[PDB]
Design a protein around this ligand. Structure first.
Ligand code: HEM
Ligand SMILES: OC(Cn1cncn1)(Cn1cncn1)c1ccc(F)cc1F
Length: 443
């Protein structure tokens, strides 16, 4: 009942190299070699048990923060979110804060959002996709459109007056680059190394101050909503409002979370769609869009593009951006047979589960018409107590980009096969240097 231990070739490496080079092969091999979807690698000195059996996802996603905890594992973010915020806060508090953010990303806010997205998409397309024909890096361009659209939805004109797409991206970048993700397995890393640290603190204070000012200026003004005003309106179980520290942290949580995943989802989708093999699916998308108007609206994209939602999801399915969900085991928990002992990190990998051949036949084929064959096997937005709260919003942007893009352009790869994924980044997407693409304007 203690899960099998993959043997540790070098006391140094643990497994950090092999895993980093091809995670699926590595984990599938671990499964066959060890005869069990549940097994333990020793990454660099800490045991990491992996729930690689999708019939058992609920063992990972359902227990409370008192058993299966995210605080430790997400400490390495304590400087982007800030010391108070999200998972660094006592459990009930964390949950309140997240709720307020989520209260701000539901279908109820999507009222003015589609126009605001669509406008940016056609604006980007009108400065940068000008010609009959042209080459672009699709991952950059999507990435840009995402950050643009998201601001348009979430900040006011006057928030945008001083902090735009550029400024903000510059700012997240000088924050993201503080991050030591390997510090999950050696928390000792958090302490010592401090070079890109003060560069992160000066960004967050810069942002936090722009904010302070905007609020101040926002209060002479009055003498309608957006993401920021929403969060300052929130009230905790007791008295307290949210402190500036906290609001700021949630605005970063949000912009940090959606920044790459949404881009990557859009880009993958478009990539598959433009591939000769996948003509049917692109016929399928093109039928879906036909009787759509030029200005879209809530109905067009929310209720009328199940096929586009299937494509977005199939992309995340094949090539999930967040490859590993993890938690710190506080109390011994059973997972199938096997007890996972306190102290272990426990993990659940969308990448491994999305290639269970029972759950997803022919897993490496991109097929938006497929459905999961084991229920809950798809964990691309996770599940249970920490299921993604931005999913409805992310796919609002992906779908609108799809719709908008495929209305007016075709696309050729400059490559025989769709790009391989690049497992070298925190958040995995197609290989940047394989995403140069040819766009054509229809007629
Ligand atoms: C394609 C877009 C996205 C993908 C593929 C994605 C993937 C995920 C996954 C796998 C989780 C669960 C994490 C865990 O179990 O530890 C998650 C959670 C979360 N996402 Fe996303 N995510 C996406 C978009 C977003 C966006 C745009 C936002 C912007 C708000 C957002 C905010 C959050 C938050 C706050 C959580 C954790 C909330 C909690 O612990 O209750 N997500 N996402
Ligand atoms: O899950 C993330 C944090 N993370 C895990 N690996 C890399 N970043 C990313 N994420 C979740 N949805 C989209 N991106 C997130 C970002 C913010 C947050 F509040 C919680 C949280 F898990």
């Amino acid at each position: 009942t203690d899960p099998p231990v993959y043997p540790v070739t070098v006391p140094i490496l643990g497994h950090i190299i092999q895993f980093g080079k091809s995670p699926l092969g590595f984990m599938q091999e671990c499964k066959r070699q060890l005869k069990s979807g549940i097994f333990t690698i020793n990454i660099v000195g800490k045991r990491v048990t992996i729930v690689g059996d999708p019939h058992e996802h609920s063992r990972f996603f359902l227990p409370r923060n008192e058993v299966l905890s995210p605080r430790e594992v997400y400490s390495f973010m304590v400087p982007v979110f800030g010391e108070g915020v999200a998972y660094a806060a006592p459990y009930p508090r964390m949950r309140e804060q997240l709720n307020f953010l989520a209260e701000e990303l539901t279908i109820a806010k999507f009222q003015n959002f589609v126009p605001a997205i669509q406008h940016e998409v056609r604006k980007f397309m009108a400065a940068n996709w000008d010609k009959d024909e042209g080459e672009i890096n699709l991952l950059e361009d999507c990435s840009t459109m995402i950050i643009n659209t998201a601001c348009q939805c979430l900040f006011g004109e006057d928030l945008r007056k001083r902090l735009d797409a550029r400024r903000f991206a510059q700012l997240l970048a000088k924050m993201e680059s503080s991050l030591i993700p390997a510090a999950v397995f050696l928390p000792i890393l958090l302490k010592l190394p401090l070079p890109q640290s003060a560069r992160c603190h000066e960004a967050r204070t810069e942002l936090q101050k722009i904010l302070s000012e905007i609020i101040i200026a926002r209060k002479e003004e009055e003498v309608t909503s957006d993401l920021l005003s929403g969060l300052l309106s929130a009230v905790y179980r007791d008295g307290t409002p949210m402190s500036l520290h906290e609001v700021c942290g949630m605005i970063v949580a949000a912009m940090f979370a959606g920044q790459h995943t949404s881009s990557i989802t859009t880009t993958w989708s478009m990539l598959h769609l433009m591939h000769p093999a996948n003509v049917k699916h692109l016929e399928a998308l093109r039928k879906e869009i036909e009787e759509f108007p030029a200005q879209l609206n809530y109905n067009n994209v929310m209720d009328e593009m199940p096929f586009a939602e299937r494509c977005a999801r199939e992309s995340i399915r094949r090539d999930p951006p967040l490859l590993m969900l993890m938690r710190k085991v506080m109390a011994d928990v059973k997972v199938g047979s096997y007890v996972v002992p306190k102290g272990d990190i426990i993990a659940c990998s969308p990448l491994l589960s999305h290639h269970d051949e029972e759950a997803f036949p022919e897993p490496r084929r991109w097929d938006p018409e497929r459905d999961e064959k084991v229920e809950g096997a798809f964990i691309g937005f996770g599940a249970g107590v920490h299921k993604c709260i931005g999913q409805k919003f992310g796919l609002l942007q992906v779908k609108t980009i799809l719709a908008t893009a495929f209305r007016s352009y075709d696309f050729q790869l400059l490559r025989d096969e769709v790009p391989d994924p690049d497992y070298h980044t925190m958040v995995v997407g197609p290989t940047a240097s394989q995403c140069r693409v040819k766009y054509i304007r229809r007629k």
